[PDB]
Nucleic acid binder design. Sequence first.
DNA 1: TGCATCCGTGAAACAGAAAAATTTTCCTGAATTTTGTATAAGTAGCTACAAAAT
DNA 2: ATTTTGTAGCTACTTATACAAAATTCAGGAAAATTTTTCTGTATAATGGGAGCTGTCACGGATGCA
Lengths: 620, 58
Amino acid sequence: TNQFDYVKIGLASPERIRQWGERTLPNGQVVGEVTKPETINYRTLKPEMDGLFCERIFGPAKDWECHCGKYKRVRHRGIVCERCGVEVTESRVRRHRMGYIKLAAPVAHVWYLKGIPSYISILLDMPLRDVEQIVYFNSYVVLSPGNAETLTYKQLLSEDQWLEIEDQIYSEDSQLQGVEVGIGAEALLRLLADINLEQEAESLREEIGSAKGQKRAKLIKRLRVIDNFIATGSKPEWMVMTVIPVIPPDLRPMVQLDGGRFATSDLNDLYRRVINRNNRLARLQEILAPEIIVRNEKRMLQEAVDALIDNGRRGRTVVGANNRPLKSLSDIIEGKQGRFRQNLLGKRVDYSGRSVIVVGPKLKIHQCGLPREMAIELFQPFVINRLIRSGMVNNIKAAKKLISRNDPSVWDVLEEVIEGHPVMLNRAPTLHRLGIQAFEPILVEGRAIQLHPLVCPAFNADFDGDQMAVHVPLSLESQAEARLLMLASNNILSPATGRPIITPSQDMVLGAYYLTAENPGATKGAGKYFASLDDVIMAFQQEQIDLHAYVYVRFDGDVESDQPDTEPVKVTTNEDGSRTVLYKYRRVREDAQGNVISQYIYTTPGRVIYNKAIQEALAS
Amino acid sequence: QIMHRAEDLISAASNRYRITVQVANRAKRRRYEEFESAEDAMMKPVLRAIIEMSDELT
DNA sequence: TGCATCCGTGAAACAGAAAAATTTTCCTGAATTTTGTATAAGTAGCTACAAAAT
DNA sequence: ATTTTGTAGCTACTTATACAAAATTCAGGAAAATTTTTCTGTATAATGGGAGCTGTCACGGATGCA
């Protein structure tokens, strides 16, 4: 956290690239470079000494072991090997070193090149199939000098014309112009590197005011790059490159597989390829082969490089033993599965457990079942701790063992470790925050998760076989806020709408319905009378009335009846407080009697239950 | 009761975050300090922390 | 110039060679115990001895 | 009246020291031995590959245009 604040995106100039793998030693002579494309040796398996896995430039895979030998222990650490120049430093030093290839030919970064705007071109003001030709060895360019004569700047000599440029030879008049025919990126290089640009964003901006109804889009663009470059320290030339970084090996790991077979990584593959191509090419210029080979060659190289960066981008998607497109540097960090989006926003943690799911009646809400099998592992350690606390277990392995023995404690301690200790449940990936909440893990036998009906809607679960998944929280702090703010009790209502979301939903409704409905003909205990105590109840178990059976009930409170009746009906004008007055529900005593001395409600004996049931659950 | 306390706790306090955290660290101390004093296996330091912050503190 | 198409997205050779390696040998050398061995006293023993408690 | 307590005592008597070379082994070296890896040649003549795939999109571009 307090190691850095902002990141600095940018480019790697050949020094910075070569500054990714120098590992200069005290013999004093630099390394980090790899002079071999092959991988581990065939006889033994050790990492050659200058190939994709050279230790001495990435690091001793065997912790403190000079590839040479002599030292096989941390004791030998800072000290390295004279004979091998292995940098003895554990092994985690690898996965991070980098090394790099001095390139025998420049390669217009695929990215800047076949990019949506082809920035290269954006800055070269030269469309593809023209600048695209220049790489790919496919045309020529005049060069600033090359066109100092009849030749016109940026005129594509292609080859026939380029040869015609060699024709009309200097053995004749004029032809004193220069050279740098752009057959390869080597010249695109000094195109770029040619230009100054301080004039751009001002001398170029001369336009920008002018050409009011002109392309506009073109220009301003071309500015803003330029400007930008100059604004940053970006010289376009840096775009083509010349020397190549290289992934710390293990990430291109490569691995013995049990059956003996091996687990090659397309990384080292693309790579190694470009190595050959390179070397070889150096040997081609070394043997001064006639161009068109060497030409060809570069072309290749070029795109070997390329594909490395990004397969399938432009030329023909490489397809190796994988019997399919390989996996370039780009794409492993891209897509749905680019590093980003799946190992990185979505990693795949432990301390978890899934299962099928099942209604957990008997077990109330804010609780969950929990199988015994899983609950252990989830809670593994915590428990062992408790062992040691109770002292029953001494070391851990002690525990470990005992844990598998399922000693009384295993099913006794545990659950003391456990309660209080919320847990979080989730039905599959769930955008909704409420999709997952905090829950109290109660043990349970079989293997499912018990599950409460009221919460079902939230997670939206069937019980036709859904599954859920569990995680468990650790810091204690992280417990807190489970409790505190996901604890499935306390969240009743949709965050998308004040509406509640807990809601008794099916049958339980119709329980309540049926409870509280209004069966017609209700005779048993109909028109009866009651007075609090839950009297009527008793009567109900003695069936004095019928669950569905209208009957008066002394209750001084308020009804709501539905179908409001408020106004009287048929007041009984007789004597003291006897207006005494009816209502489609009520029946009451005001006037002399008082204000409401009488208060019998026209309600079925169910509804009273219900009302009661609330009631008491609620206050008291 | 602890439940209603847990409610009252944050039914009349600072940011529901703001609380927690201070409930938290508290218990953190409630655990660090009084380290394994009364077993606490039942009344987790957090629980303590809560009650002594939802009733004692209140 | 809006209106074509039209990028490409989100979903098997070999023999002959040699030279390497390597690698077993050595050896050796040294370094490193042990033991011998002193060593040197002091000693803690120990062995009588003596008067005075069974 | 012996016995245990003594005191005034040693001598034997035995650690203690420290050294100490002697062992006595060990490690490393050095080969040297050899096994494995490389390197190089090859003589009738020989002179363009493989594949297929064929069902969204978009957009912005689409320069290209007629």
